[PDB]
Amino acid sequence: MNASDFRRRGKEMVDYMADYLEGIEGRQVYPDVQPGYLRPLIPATAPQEPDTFEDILQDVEKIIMPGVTHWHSPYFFAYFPTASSYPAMLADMLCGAIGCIGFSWAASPACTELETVMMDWLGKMLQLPEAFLAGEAGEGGGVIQGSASEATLVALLAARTKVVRRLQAASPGLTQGAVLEKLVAYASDQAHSSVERAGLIGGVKLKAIPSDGKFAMRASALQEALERDKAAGLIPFFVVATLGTTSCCSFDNLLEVGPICHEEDIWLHVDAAYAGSAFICPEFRHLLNGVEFADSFNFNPHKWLLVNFDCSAMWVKRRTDLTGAFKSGLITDYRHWQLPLGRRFRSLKMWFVFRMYGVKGLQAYIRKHVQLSHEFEAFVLQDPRFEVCAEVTLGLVCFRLKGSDGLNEALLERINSARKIHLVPCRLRGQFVLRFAICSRKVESGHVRLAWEHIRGLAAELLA
Amino acid sequence: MNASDFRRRGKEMVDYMADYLEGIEGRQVYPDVQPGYLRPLIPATAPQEPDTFEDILQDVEKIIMPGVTHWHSPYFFAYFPTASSYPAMLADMLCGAIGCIGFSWAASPACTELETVMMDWLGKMLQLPEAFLAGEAGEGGGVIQGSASEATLVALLAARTKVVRRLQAASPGLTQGAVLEKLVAYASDQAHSSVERAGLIGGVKLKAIPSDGKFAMRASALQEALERDKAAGLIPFFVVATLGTTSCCSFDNLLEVGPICHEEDIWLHVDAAYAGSAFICPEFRHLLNGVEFADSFNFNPHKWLLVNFDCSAMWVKRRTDLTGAFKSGLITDYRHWQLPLGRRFRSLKMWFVFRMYGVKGLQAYIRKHVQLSHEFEAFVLQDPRFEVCAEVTLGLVCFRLKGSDGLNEALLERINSARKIHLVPCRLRGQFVLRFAICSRKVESGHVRLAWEHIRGLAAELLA
Ligand SMILES: *Cc1c(COP(=O)(O)O)cnc(C)c1O
Numbered sequence: 001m002n003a004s005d006f007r008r009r010g011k012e013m014v015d016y017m018a019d020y021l022e023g024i025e026g027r028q029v030y031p032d033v034q035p036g037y038l039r040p041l042i043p044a045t046a047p048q049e050p051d052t053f054e055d056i057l058q059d060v061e062k063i064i065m066p067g068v069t070h071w072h073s074p075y076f077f078a079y080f081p082t083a084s085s086y087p088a089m090l091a092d093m094l095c096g097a098i099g100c101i102g103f104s105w106a107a108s109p110a111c112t113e114l115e116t117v118m119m120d121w122l123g124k125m126l127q128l129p130e131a132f133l134a135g136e137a138g139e140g141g142g143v144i145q146g147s148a149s150e151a152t153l154v155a156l157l158a159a160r161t162k163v164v165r166r167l168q169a170a171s172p173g174l175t176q177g178a179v180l181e182k183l184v185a186y187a188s189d190q191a192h193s194s195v196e197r198a199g200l201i202g203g204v205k206l207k208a209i210p211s212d213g214k215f216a217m218r219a220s221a222l223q224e225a226l227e228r229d230k231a232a233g234l235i236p237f238f239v240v241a242t243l244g245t246t247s248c249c250s251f252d253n254l255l256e257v258g259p260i261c262h263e264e265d266i267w268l269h270v271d272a273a274y275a276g277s278a279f280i281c282p283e284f285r286h287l288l289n290g291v292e293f294a295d296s297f298n299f300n301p302h303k304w305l306l307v308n309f310d311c312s313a314m315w316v317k318r319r320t321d322l323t324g325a326f327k328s329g330l331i332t333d334y335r336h337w338q339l340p341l342g343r344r345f346r347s348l349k350m351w352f353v354f355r356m357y358g359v360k361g362l363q364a365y366i367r368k369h370v371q372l373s374h375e376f377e378a379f380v381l382q383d384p385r386f387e388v389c390a391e392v393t394l395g396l397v398c399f400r401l402k403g404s405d406g407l408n409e410a411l412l413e414r415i416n417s418a419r420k421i422h423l424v425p426c427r428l429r430g431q432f433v434l435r436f437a438i439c440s441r442k443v444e445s446g447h448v449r450l451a452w453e454h455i456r457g458l459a460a461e462l463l464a
Numbered sequence: 465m466n467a468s469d470f471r472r473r474g475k476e477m478v479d480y481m482a483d484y485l486e487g488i489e490g491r492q493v494y495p496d497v498q499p500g501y502l503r504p505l506i507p508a509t510a511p512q513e514p515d516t517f518e519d520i521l522q523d524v525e526k527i528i529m530p531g532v533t534h535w536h537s538p539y540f541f542a543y544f545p546t547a548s549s550y551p552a553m554l555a556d557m558l559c560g561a562i563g564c565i566g567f568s569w570a571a572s573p574a575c576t577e578l579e580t581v582m583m584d585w586l587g588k589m590l591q592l593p594e595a596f597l598a599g600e601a602g603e604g605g606g607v608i609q610g611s612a613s614e615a616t617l618v619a620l621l622a623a624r625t626k627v628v629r630r631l632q633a634a635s636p637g638l639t640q641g642a643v644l645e646k647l648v649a650y651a652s653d654q655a656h657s658s659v660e661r662a663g664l665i666g667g668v669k670l671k672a673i674p675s676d677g678k679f680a681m682r683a684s685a686l687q688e689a690l691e692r693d694k695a696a697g698l699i700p701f702f703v704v705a706t707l708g709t710t711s712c713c714s715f716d717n718l719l720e721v722g723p724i725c726h727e728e729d730i731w732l733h734v735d736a737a738y739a740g741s742a743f744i745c746p747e748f749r750h751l752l753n754g755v756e757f758a759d760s761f762n763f764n765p766h767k768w769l770l771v772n773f774d775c776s777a778m779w780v781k782r783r784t785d786l787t788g789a790f791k792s793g794l795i796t797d798y799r800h801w802q803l804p805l806g807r808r809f810r811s812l813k814m815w816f817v818f819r820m821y822g823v824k825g826l827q828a829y830i831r832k833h834v835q836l837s838h839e840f841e842a843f844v845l846q847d848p849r850f851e852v853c854a855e856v857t858l859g860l861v862c863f864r865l866k867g868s869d870g871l872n873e874a875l876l877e878r879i880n881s882a883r884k885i886h887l888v889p890c891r892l893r894g895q896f897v898l899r900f901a902i903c904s905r906k907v908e909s910g911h912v913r914l915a916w917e918h919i920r921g922l923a924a925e926l927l928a
């Protein structure tokens with residue numbers, strides 16, 4: 001079709017989007033569709049002749065929607081939030097229209113330059129040390145990665161390469177294969193699975209560092225592991241410290257870990273995928289104290305900062321430390337900052353979001369969510385039948401019906417079968433725990449109260 | 465903002481998109497902006513209070529656009545085409561509205577199931593062997609990757625893992641570090657750089673296979689390299705065969721390479737990033753004869769098949785051969801098929817495109833482009849002052865002004881400085897060559913004739 005048709009159709013799509021989001025509260029959050037349901041509802045072959053937009057759009061309602069899990073219903077309380085905001089959407093539309101591939105500066109200077117500048121804005125909102133800012137003459141800078149799992153993998157590969165170079169440039173005969181055999185990487189036992197994948201791909205060993213009572217990685221445990229391993233002939237080289245674990249949203253001790261990785265000369269990567277967004281708020285910024293020591297810091301604006309998915313923010317103090325694994329001031333070659341060669345004009349989304357919401361708007365959004373999270377915690381704290389399993393700092397609450405894991409597995413089964421709200425569990429020291437996460441952009445105190453009541457009702461029934 | 469505002473603003477954005485594309489022919493293809501131009505035209509900090517959509521949109525025209533390289537101007541004849549169609553755009557808008565993250569089947573069954581089905585449609589359009597189709601009981605299947613460079617890397621990692629396992633299943637007690645040291649991978653000397661990055665990340669050795677007169681990889685050269693290396697104690701394990709090299713769009717011999725990789729038991733990956741789209745046309749399908757032998761096949765619909773960037777299609781005959789590196793019929797866990805854990809509902813784009821254009825529409829688009837490419841070749845063939853450097857099969861023509869490399873470097877400099885059209889050169893056996901690639905969706909015979917005339921004029925001037 002041509003421009004004229006797109007004005008028509010494109011505008012129809014906008015109303016569709018608005019309708020879907022406007023009425024999302026009337027959607028059943030989790031689907032009843034069975035695995036493999038879709039293939040039989042669709043032809044076996046692409047059509048030879050065109051189909052009608054109208055026809056395709058109703059297929060969306062009648063066939064696709066039944067297999068959709070609505071992350072944006074205020075009743076979606078699973079995992080962590082995924083971002084979705086009108087400003088990013090508008091931006092995404094533009095990005096697609098300009099349709100450039102920023103694999104090189106010449107392919108579109110702006111695709112590259114807006115990114116560096118936006119990463120600096122965000123860097124400043126987080127109050128990161130100047131060492132991470134590109135500016136006009138800093139050895140550091142930031143880049144948009146596809147996801148936190150990729151950011152982590154990129155850091156590990158940069159670390160791996162850096163340690164192999166140092167070792168070979170000090171031991172002539174030395175082969176890389178030799179160095180890999182003894183390379184060890186560490187992460188909290190609460191670390192995300194993206195770390196294992198990273199070690200797996202990078203071809204190195206990964207060890208877990210037992211966490212403390214507050215589920216945090218401490219200097220003590222880390223040091224022990226290091227000594228134990230150096231003494232065994234191994235070579236520590238990478239450590240991922242997590243800020244806002246996926247289990248209970250706890251925080252590794254950065255002021256204790258940073259100094260250790262520094263003195264031991266270990267690449268320290270900080271994965272704050274979820275909690276990172278909160279650091280633009282003074283109240284929480286302390287949680288990030290210690291970045292000073294990090295070689296690379298990452299968090300997902302596509303989780304809790306309203307920038308629609310496909311937007312993870314990563315910073316490093318020495319651009320060449322990163323650039324070297326795939327080979328000041330202005331950056332022109334992002335292709336040495338990530339795994340793939342191509343990339344979209346993703347920074348448009350950050351720009352539209354940061355500009356259309358403003359810093360204050362963003363801070364409010366986060367606080368409202370943390371407020372809602374504490375309201376839920378209160379409910380649980382008020383009912384003697386339940387218990388709150390971990391300190392509640394941000395938008396996640398881990399609760400439990402006082403009793404056995406069997407009793408709790410049961411409550412969960414009854415909650416999901418009821419199809420009103422959607423929750424996910426996790427194990428916290430082997431114990432079965434239920435997670436309550438504030439997600440949707442449009443969640444209100446009302447949704448939480450109703451959600452709690454519904455859970456309390458089911459627990460009661462189950463208890464009789 | 466809320467749904468109401470988005471209907472307004474969102475519709476404005478649609479007209480903006482339509483205007484930009486509608487008037488793109490009046491845009492200067494390549495920018496005059498200097499590196500680093502943007503930072504000083506934007507504030508140093510994100511705004512505290514909201515900004516106006518109206519204000520943001522004019523900033524787009526006045527500040528972003530001057531730094532944009534217009535890939536969709538019919539006068540953009542660089543690299544290879546990047547896709548952009550209204551159907552994919554409409555689809556992308558929807559994808560963002562639904563906004564789910566398909567990291568697991570439960571996160572949204574449809575995000576996963578539509579993908580498998582679409583990959584089968586495309587698989588059939590290409591007339592791939594049934595072995596690659598998921599169907600209801602095939603060990604194979606296809607997945608959308610972020611790009612051809614990632615597809616290649618994924619294949620190599622799958623290969624690496626598979627050969628390390630076999631070698632230990634043979635000599636129980638064999639270390640991985642040991643096996644990597646001797647692992648060798650091959651690619652044509654015309655292969656894309658994504659292959660080197662892959663070998664670099666995977667930590668193995670990569671060797672180039674000298675190409676023939678038609679710049680193709682032949683059985684002879686490959687076999688020679690293999691023997692030479694096995695005999696030296698090395699272990700061949702991965703071979704990338706390219707269909708549509710970026711230099712002159714030549715084709716490795718798949719009927720010669722497949723059998724070799726089979727008997728030698730080497731993982732054979734086929735990178736047809738650009739040329740692959742043409743295979744939905746019977747006339748060209750022979751170029752793909754030999755996939756039968758491939759372990760993995762890949763091409764970019766986001767290049768020459770109108771599915772907006774962020775859409776590379778990859779197929780394998782044994783899903784577990786792929787799944788194993790990151791650990792029939794219906795597929796539920798795409799997370800073991802790619803590097804990252806998260807993913808967008810990208811298949812919506814393929815669906816909208818395939819349905820709104822229909823197979824015949826797609827075939828016409830490709831043929832029209834190949835027709836235009838041959839029209840250009842004709843022009844060059846008609847002028848005794850120039851020469852065509854390689855067989856012209858698809859949308860690319862490599863030409864040259866008869867003379868020295870210096871003379872040609874000069875023509876190129878004069879073409880880019882003129883700012884009418886945009887071309888890129890490359891070296892073909894050390895010789896400086898100019899590339900002419902049909903890209904934009906809206907290119908016509910008229911654009912090509914004017915482009916040729918303009919180049920002939922500049923060549924003439926220069927020749928005096
Ligand atoms: C959500 C999460 C991830 C995964 O992020 P993606 O961008 O989906 O890869 C990684 N680490 C932590 C701590 C997370 O909370």
Ligand SMILES: *Cc1c(COP(=O)(O)O)cnc(C)c1O
Pocket residue numbers: 340341342544610611612613614656658706707708709710735736737738764776
């Ligand atoms: C364009 C191209 C690639 C790279 O594709 P992306 O998806 O941009 O990474 C790889 N191989 C060939 C032959 C190509 O033409």
